[PDB]
Write a protein that binds this ligand. Structure first.
Ligand SMILES: Cc1cc2c(cc1C)N(C[C@H](O)[C@H](O)[C@H](O)COP(=O)(O)OP(=O)(O)OC[C@H]1O[C@@H](n3cnc4c(N)ncnc43)[C@H](O)[C@@H]1O)c1[nH]c(=O)[nH]c(=O)c1N2
Ligand SMILES: Cc1cc2c(cc1C)N(C[C@H](O)[C@H](O)[C@H](O)COP(=O)(O)OP(=O)(O)OC[C@H]1O[C@@H](n3cnc4c(N)ncnc43)[C@H](O)[C@@H]1O)c1[nH]c(=O)[nH]c(=O)c1N2
Lengths: 378, 378
């Protein structure tokens, strides 16, 4: 559709991601939604295929080419299964990213290759029960006691919380310094004191494990400090562009899957003597869905090209995320409507798309936060 | 809020419906959604309280006062549990209605009192796998053989399909007459040949049993013809005003429940140093939710007053249904957004409201059909 605008590598990566999604994700997404569980074997396949190392340079064991290819791979994965896309976005951007940005050679050597291959899935632990959008108002603490960082507190909504091998954890080390008193820590998820609760019950992306985690004298070595002491907030904000490009692409992929079901259904479902695709009201909906999907893709790819070249792109990534997420609810709602009563049945799957899409306006910065960011830079 | 505009009876009925919903529906709605099942004991309580006879005159065993009181009772029930509201709307309008409109004295004597008290729940069987919005294109047949109407065919999406004691069933009796060749039948649901399939798996109103029903030489007495032969289509269209007023009120009630959770959450959840109700963006959302809810209520009550006086009100009821259903998705989406990440969790219940609300744009005539009807009468 847009292909002559893509390099051969980008096309190749897009094609491999789609073949994997068509074969391994789309037929099983309904089952995983019902089970609220993603098989470990599927995660391992995303790993083997290089989809969990797309932000890490090849020389360090990853599969980075450019951010356009990542955005393309993410759209295809999301179109197959939204929960896999969540897993993938978080693991790439806020699992690998911070270690790549701020890890020492020893830390990178221990972690990057394994994470990039998906042998070790990463989690990012910043949000707390009382603190989401105001991400700097933290109450989990870390104090250096007996040559160890000892963490105490509680994190909320940890994506990959059960399956993660390592957690990037943000805790207050120097209370009197406020926003400049937070630090980042690498915490093996088998460390005594690292207590993972039951996955939350959610409306959608039900197979993406999302867990509360409690830290009860969670003791790690002194060298598991990530970055400099007090640098925690910078580090927590250092991968917003990749994070938003990824979720924007996830929104795009979910919307697209629902649109593809609706176009198909419309060309086959006859009502009042014609396929319903021929009724003006359906035509109109389909046209609007295509427009919004294409506009979202272009926004995402724009932000991705900027990021590839190391250019400023926070606003552009936040626009993509905002637009893609809000349109995906609309596209998915119309997809349901085009199916009539069948749209509301679990068997027709557009209802799952609608449920999964809705989370994209909330995480990776709420729509309200995206607006603040875009406006503040005008 | 609006109370001085209501009669004392209307207020009394509203108050009793709300007390019942607060006590018996709202605490259990989450459980019934999870079980995809409405207890028989709750249905029987809706019966005892008079909520299942609100369209039938008191002298015939019902509780009819006026349609405003029905609209008020429906909003309160829906605010407690959407699945109960579906059950109630369908039972009142297209269960009792057609027997009241078109039944003989013998048929009314056998059925009305029992249905009005909820001892016998009614189902309405018109839609077929190939025929929804084009409701006159029917293929289930009924042929008078050996002093019996013998029905053969298939109906789709029968609300109350498992729990119904009697079904109003629409079948082709005289093929050569087209739209004027359809007839209506009263079919005890224990009649051999009346084969109820498993409830459908749905995104929401999961506790409202919605079943495919197959008719395999389903044989009933000749006198179970409802109305005159060929009158079936008229009868199927004879309660559209009540049906739409009811679902409009259901949409209204669901939206209102979600709005009430969001206002409450907003006054208690602090973020960036203030209750979030004080942030302009939340204020704006809350204001818009109230406006849409109030406008929907006024549309519903307008249609209800007209119907009470026996005045033409198809357009007005279809406006109410269209507006209330489309706004309810928006109000429920904002309700989720106001809760942030908690909005997506099953425990906070606004996600169930959002799932339940979505069906109101589809059944009781899709939004597209509502628009046709309103436009054709300008
Ligand atoms: C499934 C899932 C997965 C994840 C996460 C959530 C969920 C649901 N998140 C947490 C997520 O980032 C978080 O939910 C959002 O930041 C929103 O914060 P709260 O949930 O605290 O709502 P919060 O209380 O921040 O917001 C409530 C509402 O108020 C609004 N609001 C708040 N402040 C405002 C202001 N100043 N002006 C206007 N409006 C304002 C918001 O827009 C929102 O609509 C996370 N976190 C993490 O650390 N690691 C992870 O892996 C994940 N993953
Ligand atoms: C939970 C539940 C419960 C019930 C029901 C459904 C569900 C999901 N209904 C069936 C319901 O009334 C039905 O789904 C709608 O009439 C829509 O019809 P279809 O599902 O066949 O879609 P249909 O094929 O009619 O429509 C598909 C889409 O095309 C659009 N469309 C169709 N014709 C068009 C035209 N000419 N111009 C523009 N757009 C057009 C529609 O707006 C819709 O968006 C029912 N029925 C019943 O008999 N008894 C019952 O108890 C219930 N209850």
């Amino acid at each position: 559709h847009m292909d002559e605008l893509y390099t051969e590598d980008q096309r190749m990566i897009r094609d491999a991601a789609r073949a994997f999604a068509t074969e391994m994700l789309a037929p099983n997404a309904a089952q995983w939604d019902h089970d609220a569980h993603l098989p470990d074997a599927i995660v391992a396949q995303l790993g083997e295929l290089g989809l969990l190392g797309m932000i890490v340079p090849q020389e360090l064991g990853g599969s980075y080419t450019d951010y356009v290819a990542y955005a393309l791979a993410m759209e295809e994965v999301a179109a197959g299964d939204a929960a896999c896309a969540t897993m993938m976005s978080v693991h790439n951007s806020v699992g690998c990213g911070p270690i790549l940005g701020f890890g020492t050679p020893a830390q990178k050597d221990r972690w990057l290759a394994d994470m990039a291959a998906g042998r070790v899935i990463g989690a990012f632990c910043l949000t707390e029960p009382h603190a989401g959008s105001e991400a700097n108002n933290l109450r989990t603490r870390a104090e250096l006691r007996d040559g160890q960082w000892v963490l105490n507190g509680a994190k909320q909504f940890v994506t990959n919380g059960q399956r993660a091998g390592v957690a990037i954890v943000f805790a207050m080390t120097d209370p009197e310094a406020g926003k400049r008193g937070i630090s980042a820590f690498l915490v093996p998820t088998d460390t005594p004191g690292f207590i993972v609760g039951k996955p939350e019950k959610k409306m959608g992306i039900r197979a993406s494990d999302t867990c509360p985690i409690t830290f009860e004298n969670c003791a790690i070595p002194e060298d598991n400090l990530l970055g400099n002491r007090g640098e925690g907030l910078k580090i927590a904000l250092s991968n917003l562009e990749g994070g938003r490009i990824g979720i924007a692409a996830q929104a795009l992929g979910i919307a697209r899957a629902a649109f593809d079901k609706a176009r198909r259904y419309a060309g086959e479902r006859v009502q009042f003597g014609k396929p319903i695709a021929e009724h003006q009201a359906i035509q109109q909906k389909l046209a609007d869905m295509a427009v919004q999907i294409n506009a979202a893709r272009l926004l995402v790819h724009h932000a991705a090209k900027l990021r590839t070249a190391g250019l400023p792109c926070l606003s552009e990534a936040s626009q993509a995320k905002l637009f893609a997420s809000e349109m995906a609810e609309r596209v998915c709602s119309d997809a349901i409507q085009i199916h009539g009563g069948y749209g509301y049945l679990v068997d027709y799957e557009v209802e799952r798309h609608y449920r999964d899409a809705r989370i994209t306006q909330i995480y990776e910065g709420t729509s309200e936060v995206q607006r603040m960011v875009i406006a503040r830079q005008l």
